[PDB]
Write a protein that binds this ligand. Sequence first.
Ligand SMILES: Nc1nc2c(ncn2[C@@H]2O[C@H](COP(=O)(O)OP(=O)(O)OP(=O)(O)O)[C@@H](O)[C@H]2O)c(=O)[nH]1
Ligand SMILES: Nc1nc2c(ncn2[C@@H]2O[C@H](COP(=O)(O)OP(=O)(O)OP(=O)(O)O)[C@@H](O)[C@H]2O)c(=O)[nH]1
Ligand SMILES: Nc1nc2c(ncn2[C@@H]2O[C@H](COP(=O)(O)OP(=O)(O)O)[C@@H](O)[C@H]2O)c(=O)[nH]1
Ligand SMILES: Nc1nc2c(ncn2[C@@H]2O[C@H](COP(=O)(O)OP(=O)(O)O)[C@@H](O)[C@H]2O)c(=O)[nH]1
Ligand SMILES: [Mg+2]
Ligand SMILES: [Mg+2]
Lengths: 51, 427, 427, 150, 426, 426
Amino acid sequence: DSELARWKLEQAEGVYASAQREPLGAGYVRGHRLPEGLGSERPFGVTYDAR
Amino acid sequence: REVISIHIGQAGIQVGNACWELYCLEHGIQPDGQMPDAFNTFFSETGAGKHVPRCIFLDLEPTVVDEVRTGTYRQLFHPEQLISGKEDAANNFARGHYTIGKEIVDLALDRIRKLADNCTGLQGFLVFNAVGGGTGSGLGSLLLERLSVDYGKKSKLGFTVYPSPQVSTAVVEPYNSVLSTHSLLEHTDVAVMLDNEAIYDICRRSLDIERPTYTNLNRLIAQVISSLTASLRFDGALNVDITEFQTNLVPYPRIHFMLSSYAPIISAEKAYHEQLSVAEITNAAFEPASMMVKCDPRHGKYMACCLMYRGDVVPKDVNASVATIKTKRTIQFVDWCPTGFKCGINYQPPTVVPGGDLAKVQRAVCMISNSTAIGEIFSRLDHKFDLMYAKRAFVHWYVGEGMEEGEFSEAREDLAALEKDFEEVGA
Amino acid sequence: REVISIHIGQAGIQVGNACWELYCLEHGIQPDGQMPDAFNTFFSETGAGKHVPRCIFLDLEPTVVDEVRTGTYRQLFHPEQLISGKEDAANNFARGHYTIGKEIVDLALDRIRKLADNCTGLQGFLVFNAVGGGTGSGLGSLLLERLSVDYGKKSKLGFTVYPSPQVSTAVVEPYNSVLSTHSLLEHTDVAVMLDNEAIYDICRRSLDIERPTYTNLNRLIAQVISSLTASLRFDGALNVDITEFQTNLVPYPRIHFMLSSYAPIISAEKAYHEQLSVAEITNAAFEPASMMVKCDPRHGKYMACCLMYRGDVVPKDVNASVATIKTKRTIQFVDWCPTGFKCGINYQPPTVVPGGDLAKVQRAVCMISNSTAIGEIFSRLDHKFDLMYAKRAFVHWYVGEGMEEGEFSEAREDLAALEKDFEEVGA
Amino acid sequence: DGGPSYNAETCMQNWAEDRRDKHYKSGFHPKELRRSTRYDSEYSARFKPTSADYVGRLTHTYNTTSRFEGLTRVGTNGIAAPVLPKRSADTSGEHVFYAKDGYGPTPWMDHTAPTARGRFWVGTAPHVAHDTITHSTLRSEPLEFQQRCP
Amino acid sequence: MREIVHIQGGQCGNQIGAKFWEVVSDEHGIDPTGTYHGDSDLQLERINVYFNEATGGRYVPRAILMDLEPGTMDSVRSGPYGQIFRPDNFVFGQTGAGNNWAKGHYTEGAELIDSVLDVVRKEAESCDCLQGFQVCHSLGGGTGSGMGTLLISKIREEYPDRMMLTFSVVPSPKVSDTVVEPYNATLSVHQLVENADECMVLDNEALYDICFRTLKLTTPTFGDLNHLISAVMSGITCCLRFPGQLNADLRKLAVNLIPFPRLHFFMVGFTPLTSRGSQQYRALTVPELTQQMWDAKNMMCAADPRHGRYLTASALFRGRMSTKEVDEQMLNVQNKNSSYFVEWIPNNVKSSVCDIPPKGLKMSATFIGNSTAIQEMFKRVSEQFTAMFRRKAFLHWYTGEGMDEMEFTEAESNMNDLVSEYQQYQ
Amino acid sequence: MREIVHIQGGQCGNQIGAKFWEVVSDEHGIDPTGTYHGDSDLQLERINVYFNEATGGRYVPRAILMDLEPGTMDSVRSGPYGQIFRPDNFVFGQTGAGNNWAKGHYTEGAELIDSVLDVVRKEAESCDCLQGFQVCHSLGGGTGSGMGTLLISKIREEYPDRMMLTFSVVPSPKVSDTVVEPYNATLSVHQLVENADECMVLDNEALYDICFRTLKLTTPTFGDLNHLISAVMSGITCCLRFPGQLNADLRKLAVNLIPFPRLHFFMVGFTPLTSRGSQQYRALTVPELTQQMWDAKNMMCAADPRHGRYLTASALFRGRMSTKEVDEQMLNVQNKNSSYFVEWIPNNVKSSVCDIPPKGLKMSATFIGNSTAIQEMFKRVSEQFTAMFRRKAFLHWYTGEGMDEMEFTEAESNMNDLVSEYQQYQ
Ligand SMILES: Nc1nc2c(ncn2[C@@H]2O[C@H](COP(=O)(O)OP(=O)(O)OP(=O)(O)O)[C@@H](O)[C@H]2O)c(=O)[nH]1
Ligand SMILES: Nc1nc2c(ncn2[C@@H]2O[C@H](COP(=O)(O)OP(=O)(O)OP(=O)(O)O)[C@@H](O)[C@H]2O)c(=O)[nH]1
Ligand SMILES: Nc1nc2c(ncn2[C@@H]2O[C@H](COP(=O)(O)OP(=O)(O)O)[C@@H](O)[C@H]2O)c(=O)[nH]1
Ligand SMILES: Nc1nc2c(ncn2[C@@H]2O[C@H](COP(=O)(O)OP(=O)(O)O)[C@@H](O)[C@H]2O)c(=O)[nH]1
Ligand SMILES: [Mg+2]
Ligand SMILES: [Mg+2]
């Protein structure tokens, strides 16, 4: 019962495969590199202006 | 154009509690309640620069309610509007409809009255409840009854959460469901079913979140509700208000049960790869792999479908895709409705919640349809109701509370009458 | 040619507070008294470079008076032109007519005596008062009495504020209005009624100011007064002086009561919107949506009319418009007066006040007419006066102040005589 | 009835109107600024203030005033003792004229925007104190309450 | 200019007066030291109504404090805003009456009231044009009721032309402190109906459930009640103190609300009164203030007004508003629940507006209703009074001091006929 | 001299009207502020047909908006040439019909139409000599069709001697928005066949085809389709606003196109329409206009004219053209495809020439053909109507408001008899 030990346990067992494939809320990450703009500034998908 | 939203039960107030986080994010309101016209359908400006929602969370157990009262949105909700009883109905329809409702519904309704009097151009009501529980089922039905005798003419959108066929967390929910429908028939104008297993399979398949808690479910349900009211909140190229579903989706005064669907439910990595266009999300909104109710529409025939489009959508290609759908022969319509569709287009794209798993996409589709698979669902609940009732199991709690066998038999034959109505209509 | 104006009561001097703002703005007089011959009928040119008005404000409570003394117009008004008693009359005709009048009225008249001495070509007096109160009613009537004793033959234009039928602020205003009318009959040479419900409906309907205060009322009433003294002030194609209302609109010595009207009451946006022409404003000056007194001339018969025109008005189209009015039959005249109109034209257009709600108009119409719907007014007021008098309510205030039952009885039967009068003349 | 009452820390017996009072201090930091595992309600863990800038405003106000406003009243256990009224005339706090101080970040003052200074559908603090209607109209400023609303 | 002289009687009157001078001093922006610290010059022009200049902007009130026990004098000069009361205004007996009307009216009055008449005269002729007197006292007590009633009598015999407003708290059977509360209440009421011009009937029962239901307070100490009553008194007198769109002094209110000389017992209410939590959410519109004014649960008396008819009513509004919305609101409330008003009087609602909101609020209102539901309150007192007299109980504490039985029988008669005439107009 | 007032209903009508007033304004050279900025004199001389000078050359359109939702009003006020409108003619309800013909014709119309009649009255007697009325609406929606057609009936009962042009969008099965399109279109057609003088039927299907093939645009937003219909409406009312060598007024076109009082549904087309890539490769001659004009893919209805015959036809030419070239082109077209024209009427084409082209173009033309192929549209709607009505789908939201079954049976009767008489005259 301490933040530190509680965090070190997860830092240790992050090497597990299930620990990376079942992040309780996050979901599987795949570790893919994105082109720095599609996450926040630009939205995904093809874009043709309507307005 | 203003609409108020009431939340009954432990499930309903957790859902709308995800909804209001989404609404404040869509309108740029930080949770303390001040801005740094479009909002006026939900938040009424009052006090000092405060946009306080047109909503009442009401429930009997104070655990989740005061949880809200201490949470991040302490300053948002008007304190009086969160009604909280002292003790639960405890998954007992009779207890929530006769014992405890008799003290709570009058306070709830005469709050509702002064909210409607602050309101000016009230469109309608929309309720949030799960019919499996005790409070959301019992006093929810009692609340809808007294609201119908109060206004009657005003449209009431009921977003209910039905119990899944195999995945289930209670034992008496067949009793609660049957008794809840018996009033949901003749009080709600438009009732949308959303069970939990369908959302579970969606979160597993598309969103590839494999240990989904209730928030992920509530998060994307809030996305659906926000999507079908964005026409009221924001100006679109082709807008439809809350009165349209009343006319265009309910061919008969007792057939009002609507499957929901949403697309694209897509994560960040699956977005960078799929090309998001209109024709394929229109396709994606139609397979049972992306419906919010675990049912098989291939065994049923559609009555009328409605398609909300949000974001960057032009009317050309939506008309094209709908043409392709009507020319496909895998899915089929009834012989009554050659014009089996109703489209809608809005300009503002769906927003992202930080911490949520949905990426920012240019466009989205919310399908709300009407079919006969719902008639299959009610028979499914009817069978498992009859099995438990054959042995008179669990009945003594209702009888001990004050109910009897008359309404059990008559609610049973009421669902049998609904079944015969669906089988008569489908032909 | 000069005219001095007196303001009595709490209403009188607030109307003057807006009226004299209009005069300063129309003649380009700075609020500190000096310009950066047409003004000579209102502002005497003292010394060198200073104009100081021919007016008296008076009241018994010093609050609103020294509010004037400390407002924007400190240097403009003579220090002693504004008269102020020590303690209020407090909604009591007897108190305002017998106790406090006996010491304020003598200082008032030996003050206007030297105002008239500085004046040379006096037209007459025009008064501003309300009858619902005590100060306006009591010593307003007491002053009018001693005015009629001193000069008499000089005209007395009376713009009085009667109590509205439904909208009311006081309780004893029927008693005070009756007792004031009993002297307003044989003292004022001609009187213009001003209710408040009529003007509230005007600002609500035409100007669309949803929540109006008194200052909007005072502002457009000042616009009316300016529109009927514009003839003395400025040169027009056909100017009519103050002695014309005496002659052209009073057919009998005890029928002098006139409904007033004004057009166009239009905000800043509907101005660019509408093509202002003389035909439609001469039409709009007749429907009761534009009358300053809440009554319906449909039920009555006109006796005489008078029409002031300001701005770009040629006699051609005003003649054509009144021709269309005489040939219409929705409104009707008495048969014992065929030529029921008087015209009057002045060249200068009505000016606007910064922050005001009226727009710069090319031409405007001020209609003042006589009818028998005023006979309907007095009956409707007399009915509710008898209601209170049957039970002798509130009487002990007046009797303890010095009066008795006789004045109540005689004012009651006088209004009865005026009733018989109006019904006899109207048929 | 007059029976004994639980403390304001316990969520019962009109706790809400009390927690939301101006002279009430809690021995622990508010949930929005908490940070760890161990006693996170499910709702609280998933629902956090989305905007870091909003968190910044929140923390500035909380730290400058409410974090160390009072500490003597805090007991050994961390549960603040209720102020005990002494003298017949002693008043706990202002209840009637609640908006004694206007226009600021904290909840007890109004949160009004600088453009919507005084309007009809919105106001809880005096726009201007000691300004007469007739004064203002003579100065020709338009009456603030008459401005329209959608 | 127009002068109000304030008089406080007994323990209740002294503490209530203390909070009264706290609110008025705040509204004129004067510090508890006695020096002006405001900004707008709207305030300085009307402090002569309530204060007098001493030396270098030092303004001291025109108040007379009256009692028999030094406990109240220390409670006056200990609490805040105690440094401003003139030491000569503390006329002060020494024995203490303690719930005995005969002590309040014959023994202690006989040597205390001559000295209060000295200071009241000195403070009355020190100003020029009196508006009248304003007295706050109690009826269940002895030194308040007896001394106050005897002074009200004496000053009405000297100055018959000035106004007289009295804030009197009456006893109620649910919150009932003393035992001889009916013996004192009846004799005070018997005197007030002839000598007091108009009365504002208060009580503690109405004040307690207001602080429970509306303000939702937990420990409503006496300070909060005195603060409520203080708010009412300030709302009454706002018109003499500040300019407005329609000013209405006290005599203006008396003639609009008193149709018959004996028919002058009002019930009072104040708005707004919001929960501590709700405050921020509540908005401030004239309909929102009206729905709280005409609510029965916002009266400061123990009289459900819907048990009788309203005869007349008055509303005093403060703040920059629109008169049309004000008037049409009074018209709507007069036409919807039309049966609750008398028939032979149309337009029963007097209104007034001032343009100065109270410090800390944007827009306030004060209600003064002359209803006929007051008779049921006096009946609930007279029925108890006629209980004890039947057994001549506690009478010796009265007959042994000068009073006879005929005073009590006269009290029954006057109480019975005034409730008779109120029932007559019902 | 001859006057045309404009009435817009529903969302589709309002946005079409907005683009239409943009087109007319730019043709007459007035900016959105309402001031004149053109160059030639031929512009001002006929603007009294559409405008009223307000004050100092500020022209406002003679138009009346009409709807039930503020959303459309926000859109028309926000766009360019939105401030030019008439703030009093924004006669506008607040509840909302919601695609319910009974709600547009029985409940909301019952209290909103008296107001729009007042407005359209004031606008009619404002002018000297009316020519006709011009209504833009659709036949699918509720607040456009129902209220619009009730306005049509009330107007025809008031002014029976004036013309009436109605631009109506009909529903197509492939582009079908709502579900009660047959229930609205059938009832509206039933009203128009008796009340309206002639109707220019439109549909989004043919417009999408036109912007696909000929225009070759990428994304045809609603602004583009409305721009097309606006160019058509400018073309039909050009002969009044501009001099020509052979003028054709509105009634003149009516009498030449309507041989029988119930045969008044017109398919309309506009020329030229060419992609900006292929604009350089084409010439602008009379035969080049004609070959595009009589092209079946250039009609603005989903009705193949080669599936039927033309009863009559008309072509309005604009620009400095040769009259001899025009009639010989019409003669050759009539002689070549002699089977597509009716037998018992010679000279089946009326022609007119105006001397003013649209801005930016050299020469233009507008085609209004009264062909019998419109029965295919009515048959296609009627079969959907029968299919739904046989088993009473969606009938209670109409029945529960006041409508009976007899109205639906009558509507089927009238549609069936008009399609049979089209079949008769074919
Ligand atoms: N979608 C969704 N459903 C929920 C959630 N929480 C509870 N439910 C559903 O609610 C149903 C039972 O009712 P509850 O909401 O838990 O409780 P209740 O309706 O208030 O009835 P009581 O327990 O007697 O108070 C279960 O079948 C759950 O599926 C949630 O967070 N999201
Ligand atoms: N239209 C309008 N009416 C006013 C104005 N001021 C006062 N009144 C009216 O005057 C009537 C009563 O008289 P008051 O002006 O209030 O007071 P008074 O006539 O001086 O009598 P006292 O109060 O005794 O001084 C009320 O009904 C008000 O409506 C004003 O500025 N404009
Ligand atoms: N509202 C209020 N009531 C009070 C206060 N002080 C005393 N009382 C009431 O006064 C009543 C008795 O009056 P009392 O003090 O005996 O009067 P006195 O002895 O003549 O001065 C009791 O019922 C108390 O409730 C106070 O500060 N506020
Ligand atoms: N050309 C065009 N058609 C439109 C537009 N908006 C809607 N429509 C068509 O109008 C039909 C329905 O009309 P609707 O707007 O519902 O009428 P209303 O609801 O009564 O106002 C649909 O078939 C749409 O295709 C538009 O901007 N332009
Ligand atoms: Mg529950
Ligand atoms: Mg006055």
